[PDB]
């Protein structure tokens, strides 16, 4: 079926907790042997949110090349994606080498430090020019070269260095920072204003390497990001837009990550988001 009747459709019949969960009977499952040894637990935020072996990021590191972070390819789209975990206290250094190590321009982050009272994950940047960081276990520094603070999300420029080699590279921070503690946005508009902001800024495309994406657990927020991204681009790309069919290409984003979309009211987000961008990218 179509996207927005289709959508309609099951408003009407008020049967979005049954779509859902015949996605999650349906969606892959493959080992996560690595994520699991015991030398890894101080990786790992949630015990039950692990990256697969085969699509898992590793570290160019001959001790211990783990991180919770996996990259889903969109074959089609033409489009990659890194999801991560928010980094912790004693993985912020591990963070930054991938970023490193995998050329990516741009780092999108869609929870705030604290949430409903508890921390959601470290303080993993620096707040003031003069205070740059540095992370001795991997041999980087972080600096704040300037922020731009706006309603709905705030945008910094870092730059990273290797101190190996006193190379230095420009990395965007793109925070979106009005996601609601609880549930969903009312109106997929300010999310989508993100999306495209992070467009113009080039961390998508080609000649970068994959934007790294995260929130707390890097499958719920993330992973609407990325389906909203990659619905819009195929929708651009086909004969007949009307064909492109958000649950199927869910289904696939799911063969490089597990869990993407938590909860069924995520999901209605997603459909909302897709639909009303459709409208905007020509002109309705
Ligand atoms: O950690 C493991 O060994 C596994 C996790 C999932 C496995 C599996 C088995 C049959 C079909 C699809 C997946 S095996
Ligand atoms: O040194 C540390 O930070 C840690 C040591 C052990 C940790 C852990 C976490 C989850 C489950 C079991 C152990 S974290
Ligand atoms: O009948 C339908 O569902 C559609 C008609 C046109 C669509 C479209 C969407 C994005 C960009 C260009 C066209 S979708």
Known sequence: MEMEKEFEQIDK??????????????????????????????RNRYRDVSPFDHS??????????????SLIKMEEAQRSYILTQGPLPNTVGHFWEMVWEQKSRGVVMLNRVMEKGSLKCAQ????????????????????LISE???????????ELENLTTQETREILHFHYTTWPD?????????????LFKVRESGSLSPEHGPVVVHCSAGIGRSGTFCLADTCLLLMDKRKDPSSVDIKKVL????????????????????????IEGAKFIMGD
């Open 13 to 42: 019949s008020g049967s979005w907790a049954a779509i859902y969960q015949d996605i999650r009977h349906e969606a892959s499952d493959f080992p996560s042997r690595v994520a699991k040894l015991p030398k890894n637990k101080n």
């Open 251 to 274: 289904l696939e984003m799911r063969k490089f990550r597990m869990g993407l979309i938590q909860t069924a009211d995520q999901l209605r987000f997603s459909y909302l988001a897709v």
């Open 182 to 194: 609880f549930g969903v946005p009312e109106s997929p508009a300010s999310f989508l204003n993100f």
């Open 124 to 143: 993993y940047w620096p707040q003031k020019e003069e205070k740059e960081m540095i992370f001795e276990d991997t041999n980087l520094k972080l600096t």
């Open 56 to 69: 898992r990021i590793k570290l160019h590191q001959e001790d211990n090349d783990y991180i919770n972070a």
């Open 148 to 158: 731009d603070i706006k309603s709905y999300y705030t945008v910094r420029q870092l």
